[PDB]
Amino acid sequence: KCPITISSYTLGTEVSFPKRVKVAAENGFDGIGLRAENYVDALAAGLTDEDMLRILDEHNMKVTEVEYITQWGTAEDRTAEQQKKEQTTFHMARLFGVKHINCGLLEKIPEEQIIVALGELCDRAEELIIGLEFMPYSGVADLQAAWRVAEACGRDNAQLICDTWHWARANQTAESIKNVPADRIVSIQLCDVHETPYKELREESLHDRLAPGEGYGDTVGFAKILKEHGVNPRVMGVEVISDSMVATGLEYAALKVYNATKKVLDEAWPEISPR
């Protein structure tokens, strides 16, 4: 089993929790992703952990993705708020029954420092899996780099996330997955890329992604690579971060990315496609 999950950013940063759940459920998703910010907003709106569980249950829904841990690479970055965010994701994962937490490292630090910091983060995570996400503009720039550091840290909960946008913008291929044990890839996130990159790649990534297979990043070929390598993702996230789609409509966004996801997985991995 692999829950088709609408990732947090796919619905923006404003929508209430109950609307997020409802829009997801109405559009055929098995789960939602939640950022710590979304969770804090819900608490600020007077919702409790308990109420969030009830609402999910009311829509036959689950939170299946928890994110996003960053700013863990250096002593100066690991501030009290950083550490609060870490702790908040850990609690969120336990609460909602999620086994892994999405993680990225923006800071371009020497890799030996990354190995050590990653090990420490996995220690902090205890039973939870750290899903380290490579990104072309980050301190872990491609899949080989992510595997190198996860491997070297020597914690079994150091695992890997493949997000189509990052895969395509880091120009990854079939060879990128070489020597990466399939069972180390904890999740997959689907979307697609514009033909022409932004000047600032990080702006593009957070503002102007395309729906799966509607772009120039061979989402279909990407899914097939991971499938054939023997990856068994815990979640199939759909992470299409698009200010334009959200501005058009949440329902619009949700329908558009579901239909696109179904198109790609029908072709590439029918056994887990939504049905």
Applying CB under 5 A, which residues contact Mg ion?
163, 189, 239
Contact 209, 240 (CB under 8 A): yes
Least CB distance from residue 243 to Mg ion, whole Å?
Answer: 6
Residue nearest to Mg ion (CB): 163
* CA gap 269, 208 in Å, rounded: 26
Least CB distance from residue 149 to Mg ion, whole Å?
Answer: 18
- Smaller CB separation from Mg ion, 52 or 160: 160
* CA gap 129, 101 in Å, rounded: 6
- Smaller CB separation from Mg ion, 55 or 265: 265
In sequence order, the 6+-apart residues with CB closer than 8 A to the CB of 3 are 30, 31, 62, 64, 235, 236
Strands 185-190 and 158-163: parallel
Least CB distance from residue 162 to Mg ion, whole Å?
Answer: 9
Least CB distance from residue 68 to Mg ion, whole Å?
Answer: 8
- Smaller CB separation from Mg ion, 160 or 180: 160
- Smaller CB separation from Mg ion, 30 or 239: 239
**In terms of C-beta density within 10 A (0-12 exposed, 13-18 middle, 19 or more buried), how is residue 168 classed?**
buried
Least CB distance from residue 5 to Mg ion, whole Å?
Answer: 12
State the DSSP string of 114-131: HHHHHHHHHHHHTTSEEE
